[PDB]
Structures are given as C-alpha cells and as structure tokens.
C-alpha cells in the first residue's frame, strides 16, 4: 500500500450550561498522535509527546502568539456560539414515529427517524403500563445530514386487544408523540 503522512489541526470549543463554561482546546496531530495542545484552562502550549516539544517551546516563547491564543476562547468560541444560537441551536426537526412488527409476531420495532437535535426519549407501553424488560434499542444513529434516527425494539407476546404505544419525547415537541399498534389476534 502507498505510504501516507497525515497532519491534522483541530481548533475545538467546548460549551456547558450555555456559555457558563467555555473551553478552547487547540490540537496539533501527526498522523493519529496528538503532539501539541493549547488548553485555555492551562493558558500555554503543552507538549503531549516529545514530537511536539519544540513547537510547544517555540510558540510559548512568543508573547504575541500566547496572548492571541489566551484570548481565543472569547474571540472564537464565544463569537461563533452566538452564531450557533441563531442557527444550529435553533434547529428543530420533529421525529417521524413508525411502528412495524417483526419476527425472530413477537417483535415490535418503533422507528424514530429524521429528528434534530439528538436529545430524545423513547418509551414502550403495553396497555398504558411502561415496558422495561424486553426493550432493545439501537444506539443513536447519526445520518450525517443534520438528522438522527433510532430504533427501539420491544419483545412481545401479544394478547388480542393489547394496545402497544411508542412514546417519544423530543425538544421539538410541545407534547409527546404517541403511535399505537393494536393486536388483532393472540400470538
């Protein structure tokens, strides 16, 4: 195979509780080894590995560079977060909730598709009583197009008349979404 030499530079911001806690971590990476890091909590460049020691010492010796990096948490992260508040953080895409039976009838699949943001709570109910045993969920699935999906399976032995409800809570919903699957025969 051809040989490849990879360099990555990541200027990353971390936000918690709005902008109560804002943290900047700048990362210099050779192939997959992070070698130099600027963590705004630390306030100077730190060599993660020996490969990054000359750069860390060189940049740290430059007053003008250091002061620029120390102010970058407020200048970059806080400026861009205000842009996020008007755009990404306002994105609300309501989930599409769908029930379909399966077999391994003995399995209900609640498909919760195309929602944003990621925060979501999906519950199964059998005759208004929440089911906890026999519930198997996929991980949160990132579609890559600024939507998520997730599948929540319920192992079931249905009696005729049973109503199975998929209960979905999402920040885009003023009230939860409920979809029902009603057993027409006894399994």
């Amino acid at each position, epitope marked *: 195979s051809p040989e490849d030499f990879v360099y990555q530079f990541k200027g990353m911001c971390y936000f918690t509780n709005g902008t109560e*806690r804002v943290r900047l971590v700048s990362r210099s990476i050779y192939n997959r080894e992070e070698i130099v890091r600027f*963590d705004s*909590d*630390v*306030g*100077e460049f*730190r*060599a*993660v*590995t*020996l490969l990054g*020691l000359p750069a*860390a*010492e060189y940049w740290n010796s430059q007053k003008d560079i250091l002061e620029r990096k120390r102010a970058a948490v407020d200048r970059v992260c806080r400026h861009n977060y205000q842009l996020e508040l008007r755009t990404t953080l306002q994105r609300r895409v309501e989930p599409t909730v769908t029930i379909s039976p399966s077999r391994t009838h003995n399995l209900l699949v609640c498909s919760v598709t195309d929602f944003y943001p990621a925060q979501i709570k999906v519950r199964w109910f059998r005759n208004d009583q929440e089911e906890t045993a026999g519930v198997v969920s996929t991980p949160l699935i990132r579609n890559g197009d600024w939507t998520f999906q997730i599948l929540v399976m319920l192992e079931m032995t249905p009696q005729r008349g049973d109503v199975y409800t998929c209960h979905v809570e999402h920040p885009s919903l003023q009230s939860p979404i409920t979809v029902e699957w009603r057993a027409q025969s006894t399994g």
Partner: T-cell receptor, first 107, second 112 residues
Framework: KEVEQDPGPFNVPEGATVAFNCTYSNSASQSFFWYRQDCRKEPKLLMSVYSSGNEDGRFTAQLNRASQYISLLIRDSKLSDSATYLCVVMGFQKLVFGTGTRLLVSP | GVTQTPRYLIKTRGQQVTLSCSPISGHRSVSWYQQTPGQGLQFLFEYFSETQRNKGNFPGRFSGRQFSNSRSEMNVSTLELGDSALYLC????????????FGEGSRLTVLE
C-alpha cells in the same frame, strides 16, 4: 526514577559555592523548576530553569536537554541558605516533585 | 498569600477531618499535597473551575471540593494513623501550572 536528585545531605562551609544536580527520565519533559523548603515548612518557588542559564543573584539554574540534567548553583552560601532544595519536573499532565537535597551551611 | 485552616489538628483513628484552603486572590487552581517524612511531596488532587481536574493515587477516603470563590476543601472520611502529615495546598492562576504558591499547611496528627 522519574526525578533523581543528589541524595545525601550537603554540609557546606559558609562562603562556599554549592552545586545541586538532578536528572529526569522523560525526554518529553517541558518545564523545570527549583523549589526551596525549610524544615517542617512549605515549599517555595526559587527559580525557573532554562537552557540559556537563569541567573538571579547568587543563584544559577541551568537545563541540559541532551544529558537530561538540571543544575542549581549557589554562590557565596549563607547560613540562611540552609534548606531542602527540590527539583521539580513538569510533563504532560504530571508535575513531579523530587525528594530533595538537604543543605546545611555551617559558620 | 495562601491561607490554610486549621493550622494544627489532633484527631483519633476512625474520625473524619475537613481542611480548608483559600488560594491567592484571583487564582483558580488549588492543589493538595501530602508531606510525610521519607516520602516527600505526594499529589492528592487539583481543583479548577469547581471540578477535580487531576487526581493522585490516594485511597477513596481522601476527597476534595472547590467552591465558586475558588476556596477548596479537603476531606478524609476515616483517618488512619499513617495519615499523620503536613497537608499542603498550592494555588496557581491557571490549571496544571508548575509555578505553585503553597500555604503553610495543616499539621494533622492522628492518634489512637
């Protein structure tokens, strides 16, 4: 093993020059300091250590990354210099205090 | 500079203790160290922005805390005879600094 200083106590006559030596194992170590600690009291930052040779009064600290040696020089030692001198080495997410070399200046 | 209380304390084995450290005004990082004869300075933990940033190898009965004014507390829930030591706190402006400003310590003697 990470930070190794001169072991035994230094018994030095007043007026003599004293040389403290310290070695560190991790080549990635970034910053180096000398601390001073009087008996049963707290450590106090004495000076930062540079390759060029930091000189502050009677004190000289120097770093040699090739041999991975740190040195502290005390010219014209005074009775008040009597203390334990700690070699302190900083690497990524680890700050290591040496066990210290005790100095006793006699009149 | 750095203010530690209590400065001296006698406890018995099995008792609990809480030590307090007020860092230099404006400093945000508080570290705790244990000073015993023959072992030197041992790192307990460092607190920054009210959360524990780094931790040493001490048992779980050693715990700490940092408040919103950067004052920090250190606690031992069940003291052993071997916990007798000078407990030192050090403050620095920023996290993970090699330039530390130490208080005068809390001298804790644990007796049977």
């Amino acid at each position: 093993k990470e930070v190794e200083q001169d072991p035994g106590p230094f018994n030095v006559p007043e007026g003599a020059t004293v040389a403290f030596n310290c070695t560190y194992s991790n080549s990635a170590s970034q910053s180096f300091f000398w601390y001073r600690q009087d008996c049963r009291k707290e450590p106090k930052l004495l000076m930062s250590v540079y390759s060029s040779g930091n000189e502050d009064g009677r004190f000289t600290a120097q770093l040699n990354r090739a041999s991975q040696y740190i040195s502290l020089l005390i010219r014209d030692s005074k009775l008040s210099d009597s203390a334990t001198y700690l070699c302190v080495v900083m690497g990524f997410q680890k700050l290591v205090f040496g066990t210290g070399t005790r100095l006793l200046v006699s009149p | 500079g750095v203010t530690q209380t209590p400065r001296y304390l006698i406890k018995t084995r099995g008792q609990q203790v809480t030590l307090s450290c007020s860092p230099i005004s404006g400093h945000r990082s508080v570290s705790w160290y244990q000073q015993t004869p023959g072992q030197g300075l041992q790192f307990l933990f460092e607190y920054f922005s009210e959360t524990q940033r780094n931790k040493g190898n001490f048992p779980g009965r050693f715990s700490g805390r940092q408040f919103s004014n950067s004052r920090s507390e250190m606690n031992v829930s069940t003291l052993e005879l071997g916990d007798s030591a000078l407990y030192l706190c050090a403050s620095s402006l920023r996290a993970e600094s090699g330039e530390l400003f130490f208080g005068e310590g809390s001298r804790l003697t644990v007796l049977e």
